[PDB]
Amino acid sequence: MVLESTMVCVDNSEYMRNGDFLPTRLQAQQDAVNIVCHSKTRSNPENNVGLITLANDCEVLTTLTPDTGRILSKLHTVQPKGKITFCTGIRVAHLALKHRQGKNHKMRIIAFVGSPVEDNEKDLVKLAKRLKKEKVNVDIINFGEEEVNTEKLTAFVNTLNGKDGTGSHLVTVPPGPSLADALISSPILA
Amino acid sequence: ATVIANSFMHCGTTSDQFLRDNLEWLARATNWAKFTATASLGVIHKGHEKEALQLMATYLPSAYQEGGGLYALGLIHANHGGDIIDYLLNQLKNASNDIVRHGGSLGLGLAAMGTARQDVYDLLKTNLYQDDAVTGEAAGLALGLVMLGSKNAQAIEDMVGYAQETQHEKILRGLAVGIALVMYGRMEEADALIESLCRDKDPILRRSGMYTVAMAYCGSGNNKAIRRLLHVAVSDVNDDVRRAAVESLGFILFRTPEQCPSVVSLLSESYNPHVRYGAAMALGICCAGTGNKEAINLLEPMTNDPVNYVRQGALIASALIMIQQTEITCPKVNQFRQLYSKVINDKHDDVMAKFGAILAQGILDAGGHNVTISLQSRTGHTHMPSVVGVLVFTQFWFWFPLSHFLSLAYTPTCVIGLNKDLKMPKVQYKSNCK
Amino acid sequence: DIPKGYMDLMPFINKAGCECLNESDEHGFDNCLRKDTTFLESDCDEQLLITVAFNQPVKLYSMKFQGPDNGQGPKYVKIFINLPRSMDFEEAERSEPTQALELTEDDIKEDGIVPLRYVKFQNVNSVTIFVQSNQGEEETTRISYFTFIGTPVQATNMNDFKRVVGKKGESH
Amino acid sequence: LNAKVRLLREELQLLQEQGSYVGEVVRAMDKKKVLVKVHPEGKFVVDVDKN
Amino acid sequence: AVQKVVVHPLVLLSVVDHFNRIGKVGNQKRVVGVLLGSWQKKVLDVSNSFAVPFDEDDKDDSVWFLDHDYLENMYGMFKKVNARERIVGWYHTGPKLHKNDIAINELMKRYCPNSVLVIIDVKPKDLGLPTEAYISVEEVHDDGTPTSKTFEHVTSEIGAEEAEEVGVEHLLRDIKDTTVGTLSQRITNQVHGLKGLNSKLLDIRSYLEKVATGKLPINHQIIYQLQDVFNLLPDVSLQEFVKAFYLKTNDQMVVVYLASLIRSVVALHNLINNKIANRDAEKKEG
Amino acid sequence: PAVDTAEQVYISSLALLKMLKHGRAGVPMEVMGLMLGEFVDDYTVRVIDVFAMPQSGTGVSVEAVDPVFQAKMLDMLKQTGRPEMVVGWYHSHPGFGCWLSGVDINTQQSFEALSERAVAVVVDPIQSVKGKVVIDAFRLINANMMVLGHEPRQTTSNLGHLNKPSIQALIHGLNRHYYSITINYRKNELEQKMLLNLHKKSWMEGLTLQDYSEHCKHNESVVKEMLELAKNYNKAVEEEDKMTPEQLAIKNVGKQDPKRHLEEHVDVLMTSNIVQCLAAMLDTVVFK
């Protein structure tokens, strides 16, 4: 029932295209985004959700909308033909959240980190510090191939919530069943 | 206009015969007309002093009614506030966030003319910062009068900052004369507020700067200020600013009335009517008490100008010039009175031309034919009340109730036989003309 | 208290618009709007950014930014009016404020009302407060009470148009 | 120069005024209304200017 | 390509209004909006422009948020109001281009393949127009150099329609110079043209100094355009040209002399008439 | 209470241009749109922006204000930074002048229902074809107060009687059902230094030497016509008929030989020649 605006960062990098997941990485992330958007919209009928592609520099395909239809339609044609830039993506998502229609909505960002984050640890820690005071909760979903529980991402999530943590989680999914079912457990429920 | 004319022709006479005789007629005016009527009733008892405090309460015990009562009470103690200053301060403090504040600010400013009391200035500053249009309109003039000729850096700073920082153009109209009066008599001390206001983008602030030049350079016909005003009148774009520039010439040259009709010789025939009205008012203020007989000649054809406000201004200036004058002194007095009567009685004439004719009759008959308009004192000094009143009255193109400020400019034309402290011995002195 | 002819803007605060930045979870924004001991603190630093939205354009005369006397109350307050978008702490410092305030210890008191330059706040729709420091230089600042005193500026609700005279189908 | 400028401005001001119709007159009616017949339209009972 | 861009007066007042309103509340460098206009054969004619929310971070230079749904909804509203206007590009009041302008240009191209960036400066500069239309060009550069998105330039000029012209004339009826070649205005214009030539030459000299010192790269193109300019110099002091120019100057001076003689004769006649009028009035006085 | 004749509907530079453009788009029909501004105080109504409402078969009537369109337009303009209120409405009167009809009065009353100061603006894109901009601001006169009081507007100042009513507005109901409001144009620099660029003249235009061929042709033609005019001036002056010469100078006034077609041409010739020669010398000096 909490009024929050989610800006899912779906990755369309070239690494998002080695199908360690059953159908393909892209299809797994599509199912994950579908489930997350449906859960967010059902939890509260007045909440919003948008998506930003994390390949090349960034893209804002679907600015905050109350309907998941636009998000799902834009999710097709993701065309994973680039490389990821996590810090820039998070910054763009934060700007989009700042442009929220209703200021009451709680900050929340879901990032589909499916390719290695070629970003320094210091940049991630600084971004986490900025997000902390700004009051934006980022939920990192480590995807497929990576350093198991990537150190940079885990440190980022840890600094996003220190000595007390809620609404800020990191989920690491080892290869296997479609990640859509896994996301229903950790992030969506809590 | 008729109410203010009755006020003028009964000024200081303590004779309200018209107001009492025609009671249904007086009450037939509602809204701001009632404010003007109350102010006129108060001013009619100019100098009444002690009795006024409860006389106003008995006469005038509605928001407009109370505001007019305060304004008139302030008018009664013109330049001689005393305890009325404290009473009006208390009244304005316990104001109703209403035009009553406007009236109280005007009255308090009139009472403490030049006293520069810090408490009054602070109350006026609070009222102005209230930013209530009419309230600010009165507060600007109140601040100007309170710090008249005081050259207060803080006062000028606050007033100019507000002028540059507020909407409600009426508040700017008030602050214009506020700033102009805050620099009365210096004529050199600052010389920088003039430039700052003249270069300012807002036309109201340009008018402020030019009224400042008029007030500061009052009397001494400094050719620098005259050239600045004339250049602004020739060049400036806003028409009200041109009016003010042309009109300040009277305040700047009233000490040398002979040359003054020359500068306006054909400045009264410029294609823009605003400059024409400014020239007419410059003649009126310039030859304020002298029947120069050249200003009357210039006004005579201007009295038939196709525009209206030009005719209004010309008639008012002619009335000012011809105050206190018989047929022998100037042979155009009877003709001008007949013209006033025709214009007032004429039905197809514009209301603006008639507002003038009525004001002209009031000016002509001011004080039962006893008070005269003399910006100069008998000893040559510059009469601050007269100049301030004339400036505020000329600033009636924006606010009708301000016309009462011309009451200050009426100085009695009498020689009183005071031999001892309280003895007025019945010495009968003769003249050399019938 | 309050000034003559003016009313507090508590009824005119739109809960949808209001949002706080850096607010601690234990003590949220809603606490600072109640005339109780409940207060709002900032979890990550002394800097806080509190923004409030108004249903219809309101006028700002006086604001009561009360705080605890322990020293964690507000010291330097920056205010902006009619901000189109949320404010970033880095961008907030750079921008010039509508009326920068250096709240003295007297203002922080429960009876302390800090005056605002009424001229600038004439059509305020959303005012944002930037507490740049607390009196005691504490790690986290707190706001015991906070509300704005002014008048409601009549606003045309064209969402309530509706024909009041005449018959439908007319033209011209 | 001012007279020339005023003449030109008056000419411009008068030009903007609408051109008047022209129609024959049948007969006076009541010393204040005159029956006239404009060119394309029909008859009209019109008043008379003061002059 | 786009051979020229005509920015109507309303676009400018809209871009001045947007910059003022955004600057008045908060502080933001540059102001981004979408330009709406119609396409002639090759001359794009921008008529209207609407604001679009735009947050950017100068430090990162790669973070920037521009509303997609907001832009589409505004375009739909304007299409309902007037459908003859299709999106043709974007404008930003920033005096200089920005490193992220290319991404914004691509986003605009998403709505219009031929996008023109008109940089509408909101700082009054007395020398030059307030618009600079830019387009995106991807080429191979021919001369064996790395290729990049860059921004090709297209000539810009400010025109107007009847309604906008009437509004402009009413607005500037108090600060407008008289139409007609009065000698004062002609001499002032010539001075203005000399000043503009001096400013352009100073800019060219500064760029040449930068190239010589190495601060900026030697273009290898446009530079030889400056060389062509220096070749096109008139080469005055040639004997034949000197004789022809002296002939022309004398031919004009003879006409000026005739005009001066006519003026002197007319003035003398007027003086005679005025003197006779004064003498007649004096004689008839007594 | 009462409205002062000193009230001034401040129309911004952008608002006037947008209203003129919208009106000129619709002609031959009638366009309408809501005006965005502030009721800053009792004696001033400031309009900052005007956004057109879509043309509809209804025309300019209460049903032309599509509630969904207006709501979404205001909501989306708020984000950009224009949180202004609806201060009034404007509609174009093609052909006929600025006045209000019955449906216009009904719409104005409906607008007044929301706010008592909702000014109404009428703009005629066809009459405003030259330096004249025929724009009027009208508000409804409570026909009740027509008898309850007298007129509707206080005249505490002279800032309103400096204008004149129009026979058209008078015929259609001015000072009877509708009363005009003085329209003041709020113009500022930046918005006046940007508009002096429609025709700013490039520096090059002030250094172009014209063309010597048509320059010579123009000089020759003007000189020949001035020779004819000098013949005429000779005839007029040498005649010097003294049969009441003051009357002769007034019975031959037709904008003819003496000076009008006279030194006017001298000025044309001398201005052109001096400017051309100065430009030529400036080019001979500047360019090599």
Side-chain angles (χ1 to χ4, degrees):
Chain A
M1 207 55 38
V2 58
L3 262 206
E4 82 311 354
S5 277
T6 277
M7 260 276 282
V8 306
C9 313
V10 317
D11 174 358
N12 69 307
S13 72
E14 213 90 8
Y15 289 16
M16 199 67 28
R17 184 260 282 291
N18 59 354
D20 50 358
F21 287 56
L22 309 91
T24 289
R25 188 95 52 147
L26 255 292
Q27 286 67 350
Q29 86 160 0
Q30 282 208 7
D31 291 12
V33 309
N34 218 345
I35 277 50
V36 83
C37 88
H38 266 62
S39 42
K40 272 332 194 285
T41 281
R42 280 200 308 94
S43 34
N44 173 295
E46 311 85 15
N47 56 32
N48 277 339
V49 45
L51 86 87
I52 287 192
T53 62
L54 285 197
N56 258 315
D57 46 347
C58 267
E59 277 215 279
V60 202
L61 307 164
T62 182
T63 280
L64 275 173
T65 76
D67 73 63
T68 89
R70 304 247 303 295
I71 314 157
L72 261 207
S73 202
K74 294 294 172 334
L75 226 308
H76 302 167
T77 73
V78 148
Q79 275 320 85
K81 78 201 321 313
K83 169 195 310 301
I84 181 191
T85 82
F86 183 62
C87 186
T88 299
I90 290 308
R91 290 153 162 293
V92 173
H94 174 50
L95 290 201
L97 297 147
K98 278 227 297 301
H99 285 241
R100 200 166 49 269
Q101 201 43 290
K103 304 303 198 225
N104 174 14
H105 297 0
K106 274 282 171 33
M107 292 339 164
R108 148 92 60 211
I109 290 190
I110 310 153
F112 278 25
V113 200
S115 150
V117 182
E118 75 305 349
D119 274 6
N120 196 265
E121 199 68 354
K122 184 272 155 188
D123 301 354
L124 257 288
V125 298
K126 165 211 49 54
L127 200 277
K129 294 295 224 41
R130 194 171 87 159
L131 290 209
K132 267 239 58 37
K133 156 155 89 162
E134 274 164 350
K135 216 119 273 58
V136 60
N137 291 122
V138 75
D139 218 37
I140 279 301
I141 321 191
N142 201 335
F143 210 114
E145 82 286 50
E146 92 307 349
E147 49 280 351
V148 172
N149 274 299
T150 284
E151 75 287 18
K152 26 194 62 62
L153 277 277
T154 166
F156 174 57
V157 152
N158 283 342
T159 166
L160 213 78
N161 53 285
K163 290 129 85 180
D164 74 69
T166 317
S168 54
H169 320 93
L170 171 165
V171 176
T172 326
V173 166
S178 150
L179 167 142
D181 54 60
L183 307 198
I184 89 164
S185 76
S186 152
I188 280 146
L189 161 72
Chain B
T2 297
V3 162
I4 39 179
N6 153 281
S7 155
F8 283 177
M9 81 185 48
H10 294 226
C11 171
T13 78
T14 74
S15 159
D16 51 340
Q17 272 98 47
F18 201 150
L19 253 67
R20 172 181 25 67
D21 190 316
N22 294 74
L23 206 43
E24 286 66 9
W25 180 84
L26 177 63
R28 184 183 72 147
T30 185
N31 311 104
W32 280 110
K34 188 151 65 147
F35 183 70
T36 307
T38 318
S40 161
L41 167 156
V43 86
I44 220 167
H45 298 165
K46 166 177 198 39
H48 210 124
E49 204 59 9
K50 59 227 200 334
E51 320 188 338
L53 204 186
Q54 84 314 310
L55 165 141
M56 267 312 319
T58 68
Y59 264 2
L60 262 282
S62 187
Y64 290 5
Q65 215 53 290
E66 192 96 340
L70 241 37
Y71 174 24
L73 178 46
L75 261 155
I76 269 171
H77 313 69
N79 204 2
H80 178 25
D83 45 339
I84 217 80
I85 270 300
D86 266 324
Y87 158 81
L88 273 191
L89 193 85
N90 173 275
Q91 213 63 7
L92 193 79
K93 187 78 48 60
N94 295 12
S96 91
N97 283 13
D98 154 21
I99 313 146
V100 47
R101 293 181 170 251
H102 173 102
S105 204
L106 263 201
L108 193 180
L110 266 162
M113 219 166 325
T115 88
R117 299 189 25 169
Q118 183 55 350
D119 153 42
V120 153
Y121 176 75
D122 270 7
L123 202 159
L124 297 192
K125 189 142 69 58
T126 326
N127 267 33
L128 174 48
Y129 284 6
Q130 226 69 47
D131 193 277
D132 196 355
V134 295
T135 285
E137 153 76 84
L141 249 175
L143 279 189
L145 301 192
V146 159
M147 310 281 324
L148 177 46
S150 201
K151 158 55 86 211
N152 209 160
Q154 193 267 8
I156 204 192
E157 209 173 271
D158 279 2
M159 268 183 28
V160 185
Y162 205 92
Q164 313 179 326
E165 194 176 66
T166 166
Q167 326 310 292
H168 314 272
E169 166 166 325
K170 166 159 311 183
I171 278 194
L172 291 171
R173 292 200 254 259
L175 252 51
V177 180
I179 311 160
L181 290 162
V182 56
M183 288 283 100
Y184 158 100
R186 320 317 268 243
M187 143 184 306
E188 271 318 321
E189 257 185 69
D191 209 323
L193 187 73
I194 298 176
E195 212 51 42
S196 180
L197 307 178
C198 261
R199 284 191 321 82
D200 218 38
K201 290 152 309 318
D202 187 275
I204 291 318
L205 269 293
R206 243 179 279 153
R207 227 165 37 84
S208 212
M210 292 212 285
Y211 280 152
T212 278
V213 77
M215 286 297 83
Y217 285 61
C218 174
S220 322
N222 195 312
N223 277 132
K224 254 175 76 85
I226 270 176
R227 71 168 46 177
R228 172 186 292 297
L229 288 157
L230 260 165
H231 167 240
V232 157
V234 151
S235 146
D236 207 309
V237 287
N238 203 219
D239 272 359
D240 310 347
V241 81
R242 274 147 94 123
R243 260 206 321 100
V246 166
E247 164 193 302
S248 292
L249 287 160
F251 289 98
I252 220 178
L253 295 163
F254 83 104
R255 179 144 323 164
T256 166
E258 38 210 298
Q259 313 197 275
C260 155
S262 97
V263 53
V264 194
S265 305
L266 273 175
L267 181 38
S268 48
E269 291 339 284
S270 170
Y271 68 84
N272 84 53
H274 285 77
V275 155
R276 254 176 311 177
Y277 168 100
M281 201 60 30
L283 260 181
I285 321 180
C286 181
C287 329
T290 49
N292 234 321
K293 169 197 300 292
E294 325 197 273
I296 301 299
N297 296 157
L298 270 206
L299 304 205
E300 194 151 70
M302 281 203 343
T303 316
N304 197 32
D305 227 0
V307 203
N308 37 2
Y309 48 99
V310 53
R311 278 202 300 266
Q312 158 180 129
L315 290 179
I316 292 186
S318 84
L320 286 147
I321 295 170
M322 292 171 351
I323 182 186
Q324 243 203 324
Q325 293 309 352
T326 167
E327 171 46 0
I328 325 161
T329 47
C330 33
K332 304 272 181 113
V333 152
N334 277 115
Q335 193 283 359
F336 265 65
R337 205 165 321 206
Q338 300 311 59
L339 167 58
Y340 297 170
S341 189
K342 164 192 151 43
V343 61
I344 189 42
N345 298 271
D346 199 346
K347 260 304 320 291
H348 312 337
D349 259 9
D350 184 27
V351 288
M352 222 35 63
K354 75 174 47 59
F355 183 81
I358 297 157
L359 276 192
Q361 287 204 252
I363 299 298
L364 267 203
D365 290 347
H369 313 72
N370 304 55
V371 277
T372 205
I373 286 295
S374 74
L375 276 160
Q376 224 165 14
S377 205
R378 51 197 79 269
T379 86
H381 203 44
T382 173
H383 202 21
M384 140 184 297
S386 164
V387 86
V388 161
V390 184
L391 187 46
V392 183
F393 157 79
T394 71
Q395 188 152 282
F396 84 105
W397 207 57
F398 308 131
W399 210 224
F400 274 168
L402 289 189
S403 299
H404 295 94
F405 266 56
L406 187 37
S407 73
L408 275 40
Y410 293 140
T411 286
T413 52
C414 59
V415 278
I416 295 332
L418 188 42
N419 69 333
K420 191 37 50 197
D421 50 0
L422 270 159
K423 176 165 169 217
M424 194 175 169
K426 287 195 286 296
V427 159
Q428 325 88 13
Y429 39 52
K430 315 120 176 82
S431 47
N432 300 310
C433 94
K434 32 248 112 264
Chain C
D1 197 3
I2 68 77
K4 274 247 301 180
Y6 289 153
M7 77 211 41
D8 67 342
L9 297 185
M10 202 44 47
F12 291 104
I13 295 146
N14 171 16
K15 291 68 66 185
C18 40
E19 81 176 30
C20 241
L21 315 184
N22 208 353
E23 69 205 305
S24 178
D25 321 284
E26 307 176 353
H27 327 127
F29 162 72
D30 192 2
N31 322 93
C32 89
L33 263 305
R34 317 162 171 278
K35 293 204 42 54
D36 306 5
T37 89
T38 70
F39 56 96
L40 163 147
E41 86 181 347
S42 34
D43 226 316
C44 322
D45 209 67
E46 78 250 40
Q47 310 297 266
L48 92 85
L49 221 151
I50 166 155
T51 194
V52 73
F54 298 87
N55 308 56
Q56 84 259 57
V58 81
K59 285 153 81 149
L60 285 198
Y61 178 92
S62 66
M63 98 168 149
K64 61 190 32 194
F65 218 51
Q66 309 168 359
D69 202 2
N70 184 10
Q72 334 184 333
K75 198 195 76 42
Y76 190 67
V77 153
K78 260 198 199 145
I79 295 192
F80 313 75
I81 89 179
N82 300 55
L83 262 193
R85 62 194 158 76
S86 303
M87 219 43 220
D88 280 350
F89 278 90
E90 301 79 347
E91 183 191 331
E93 275 167 38
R94 174 179 59 82
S95 268
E96 299 90 356
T98 183
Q99 173 154 330
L101 248 66
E102 239 280 6
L103 272 36
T104 173
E105 262 216 31
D106 292 356
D107 295 321
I108 287 169
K109 306 321 177 38
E110 307 106 350
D111 48 348
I113 299 330
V114 85
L116 310 189
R117 293 192 41 63
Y118 198 88
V119 48
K120 306 259 211 92
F121 313 89
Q122 287 307 335
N123 258 21
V124 86
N125 264 23
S126 72
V127 50
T128 89
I129 286 81
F130 183 172
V131 182
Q132 186 152 41
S133 34
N134 44 357
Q135 305 294 171
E137 185 33 298
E138 309 308 315
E139 80 292 21
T140 172
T141 89
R142 281 104 74 87
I143 290 324
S144 38
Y145 187 38
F146 145 85
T147 166
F148 279 36
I149 288 266
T151 166
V153 176
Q154 298 296 344
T156 62
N157 190 187
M158 188 63 49
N159 188 197
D160 300 0
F161 199 32
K162 160 191 55 56
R163 174 182 290 270
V164 186
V165 58
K167 312 306 169 300
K168 323 168 39 45
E170 72 176 13
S171 58
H172 164 50
Chain D
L1 216 43
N2 191 29
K4 212 152 66 179
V5 152
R6 215 137 83 177
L7 190 162
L8 270 191
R9 262 161 159 61
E10 284 303 7
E11 199 166 305
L12 252 286
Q13 181 77 341
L14 284 285
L15 262 209
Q16 302 319 153
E17 269 338 284
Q18 283 274 130
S20 62
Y21 305 118
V22 67
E24 279 270 88
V25 157
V26 157
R27 74 185 141 99
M29 279 219 159
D30 49 7
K31 283 184 178 180
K32 315 199 50 183
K33 324 282 221 173
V34 187
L35 173 64
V36 317
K37 176 179 181 180
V38 312
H39 177 298
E41 291 70 58
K43 304 203 271 313
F44 276 143
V45 190
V46 284
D47 55 29
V48 162
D49 215 31
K50 61 211 69 163
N51 64 347
Chain E
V2 200
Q3 165 267 304
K4 141 167 82 135
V5 162
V6 182
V7 178
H8 282 206
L10 183 158
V11 175
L12 301 180
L13 283 190
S14 308
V15 175
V16 167
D17 174 45
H18 185 359
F19 173 76
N20 282 346
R21 48 159 143 173
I22 276 305
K24 188 172 294 325
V25 286
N27 197 34
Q28 195 200 271
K29 222 178 307 296
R30 103 184 305 176
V31 168
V32 189
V34 152
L35 278 175
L36 290 44
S38 100
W39 265 94
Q40 223 40 37
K41 49 147 43 70
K42 260 292 184 29
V43 317
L44 165 49
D45 198 341
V46 277
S47 310
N48 230 329
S49 100
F50 65 85
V52 317
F54 181 78
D55 229 314
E56 87 184 57
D57 269 36
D58 62 317
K59 287 351 190 177
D60 211 286
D61 93 359
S62 184
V63 194
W64 62 279
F65 168 99
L66 193 146
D67 265 357
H68 304 182
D69 37 349
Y70 184 101
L71 202 164
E72 290 146 6
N73 290 41
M74 209 70 247
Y75 184 30
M77 302 261 180
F78 273 67
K79 287 206 48 89
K80 244 173 276 168
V81 152
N82 191 319
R84 187 83 46 57
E85 311 165 322
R86 335 176 54 61
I87 287 172
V88 315
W90 58 304
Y91 77 95
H92 75 72
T93 89
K96 305 288 177 305
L97 278 166
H98 279 44
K99 303 330 185 196
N100 60 1
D101 289 325
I102 269 296
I104 311 191
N105 187 44
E106 225 64 0
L107 195 145
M108 272 329 131
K109 248 193 207 277
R110 194 177 301 310
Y111 297 92
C112 171
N114 301 343
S115 98
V116 305
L117 172 129
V118 202
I119 279 196
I120 305 201
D121 187 19
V122 278
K123 304 328 301 179
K125 54 189 31 72
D126 57 356
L127 203 162
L129 257 51
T131 70
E132 306 228 31
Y134 293 172
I135 206 166
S136 161
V137 279
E138 291 305 20
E139 287 328 342
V140 304
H141 282 3
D142 159 78
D143 61 13
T145 310
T147 70
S148 35
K149 311 200 82 297
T150 78
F151 268 96
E152 178 43 275
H153 164 94
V154 293
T155 192
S156 158
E157 86 181 0
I158 294 169
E161 95 188 57
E162 277 321 298
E164 302 165 357
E165 190 141 345
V166 84
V168 152
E169 226 147 43
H170 188 172
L171 254 71
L172 310 176
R173 212 211 301 277
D174 51 25
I175 83 153
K176 158 164 105 184
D177 42 275
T178 59
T179 301
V180 149
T182 166
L183 213 58
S184 317
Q185 263 296 348
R186 308 297 302 265
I187 303 297
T188 298
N189 260 179
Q190 309 221 153
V191 166
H192 178 34
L194 278 189
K195 204 168 325 282
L197 179 40
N198 190 358
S199 166
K200 304 312 211 193
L201 285 208
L202 266 275
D203 248 16
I204 286 191
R205 177 185 70 82
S206 272
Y207 177 78
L208 287 201
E209 299 160 69
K210 281 189 203 332
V211 152
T213 312
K215 329 286 206 162
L216 221 41
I218 308 198
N219 272 0
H220 163 47
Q221 32 263 54
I222 312 322
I223 165 157
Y224 55 51
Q225 189 216 323
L226 247 188
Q227 232 171 186
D228 196 316
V229 149
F230 267 100
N231 168 137
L232 231 50
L233 271 198
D235 185 5
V236 152
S237 191
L238 206 74
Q239 211 47 13
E240 155 170 322
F241 170 81
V242 152
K243 316 301 325 195
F245 178 85
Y246 265 141
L247 180 71
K248 274 323 281 193
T249 279
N250 312 339
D251 182 323
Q252 270 143 220
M253 293 313 323
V254 46
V255 154
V256 175
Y257 167 47
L258 160 57
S260 96
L261 200 31
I262 279 286
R263 214 175 81 122
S264 85
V265 85
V266 159
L268 257 205
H269 169 279
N270 266 35
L271 192 271
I272 296 206
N273 197 306
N274 174 306
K275 220 167 273 314
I276 79 166
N278 253 18
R279 161 165 326 292
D280 287 8
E282 142 169 40
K283 293 325 162 293
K284 185 209 69 52
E285 160 268 342
Chain F
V3 168
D4 201 10
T5 34
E7 188 165 357
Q8 292 199 8
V9 172
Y10 285 111
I11 270 181
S12 57
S13 37
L14 173 65
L16 173 68
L17 280 184
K18 285 212 240 184
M19 272 163 17
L20 275 167
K21 215 196 84 84
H22 191 34
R24 190 35 168 288
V27 296
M29 204 179 179
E30 294 183 15
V31 317
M32 141 169 162
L34 293 197
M35 230 190 317
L36 269 64
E38 325 159 46
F39 303 121
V40 50
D41 79 25
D42 282 347
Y43 309 85
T44 164
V45 152
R46 156 173 323 148
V47 309
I48 310 186
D49 230 337
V50 82
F51 77 96
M53 281 222 52
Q55 226 183 338
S56 297
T58 73
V60 42
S61 177
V62 183
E63 295 74 17
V65 213
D66 197 355
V68 76
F69 178 93
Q70 149 271 347
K72 197 132 50 74
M73 181 65 98
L74 285 185
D75 210 39
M76 306 190 359
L77 275 188
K78 197 184 172 323
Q79 247 152 187
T80 278
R82 177 157 302 304
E84 290 324 325
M85 55 183 30
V86 179
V87 155
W89 64 286
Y90 80 106
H91 72 323
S92 289
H93 274 213
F96 26 70
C98 304
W99 42 271
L100 288 200
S101 277
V103 318
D104 295 339
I105 308 273
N106 317 125
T107 44
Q108 177 45 39
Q109 162 62 249
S110 33
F111 274 95
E112 289 207 343
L114 321 175
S115 154
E116 301 76 11
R117 232 139 44 230
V119 154
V121 166
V122 174
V123 192
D124 179 22
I126 306 163
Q127 272 177 275
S128 69
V129 72
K130 310 299 187 21
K132 170 186 205 14
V133 178
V134 47
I135 190 144
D136 298 357
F138 295 135
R139 178 170 17 220
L140 287 197
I141 315 179
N142 309 4
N144 307 358
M145 308 314 172
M146 179 181 180
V147 288
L148 272 46
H150 51 106
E151 313 300 345
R153 282 190 298 175
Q154 298 163 177
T155 309
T156 71
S157 324
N158 191 356
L159 272 14
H161 289 246
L162 314 162
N163 63 189
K164 301 182 179 302
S166 61
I167 173 61
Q168 46 271 20
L170 293 175
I171 297 176
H172 300 260
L174 185 53
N175 295 303
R176 296 201 305 272
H177 309 276
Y178 59 81
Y179 69 72
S180 295
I181 314 190
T182 61
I183 285 284
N184 180 102
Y185 307 99
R186 185 150 157 264
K187 37 194 169 302
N188 68 343
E189 289 184 3
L190 179 49
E191 283 180 355
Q192 290 192 26
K193 292 184 183 303
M194 194 110 305
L195 274 185
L196 270 188
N197 288 4
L198 216 186
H199 329 278
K200 188 189 180 61
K201 280 188 177 61
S202 68
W203 54 269
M204 303 98 63
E205 179 61 20
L207 284 172
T208 279
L209 278 35
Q210 184 164 210
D211 167 11
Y212 280 108
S213 269
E214 86 284 15
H215 193 236
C216 293
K217 274 152 50 83
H218 171 270
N219 249 28
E220 161 185 309
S221 160
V222 177
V223 172
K224 271 144 78 294
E225 152 175 299
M226 198 207 317
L227 159 72
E228 313 271 29
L229 280 203
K231 283 189 185 23
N232 282 10
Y233 184 53
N234 186 201
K235 150 170 68 156
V237 152
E238 87 97 15
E239 142 262 306
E240 191 227 355
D241 274 350
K242 303 171 184 175
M243 37 78 67
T244 321
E246 55 270 28
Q247 292 299 109
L248 213 32
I250 205 64
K251 75 169 64 66
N252 206 346
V253 283
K255 201 187 78 172
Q256 319 170 201
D257 155 38
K259 290 97 180 64
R260 294 154 293 301
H261 300 0
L262 227 332
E263 75 275 16
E264 253 172 71
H265 283 334
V266 164
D267 273 310
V268 160
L269 270 192
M270 182 175 338
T271 285
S272 190
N273 293 275
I274 284 287
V275 162
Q276 171 94 17
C277 171
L278 177 45
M281 321 286 258
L282 287 205
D283 284 2
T284 37
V285 169
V286 152
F287 303 113
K288 278 293 280 300

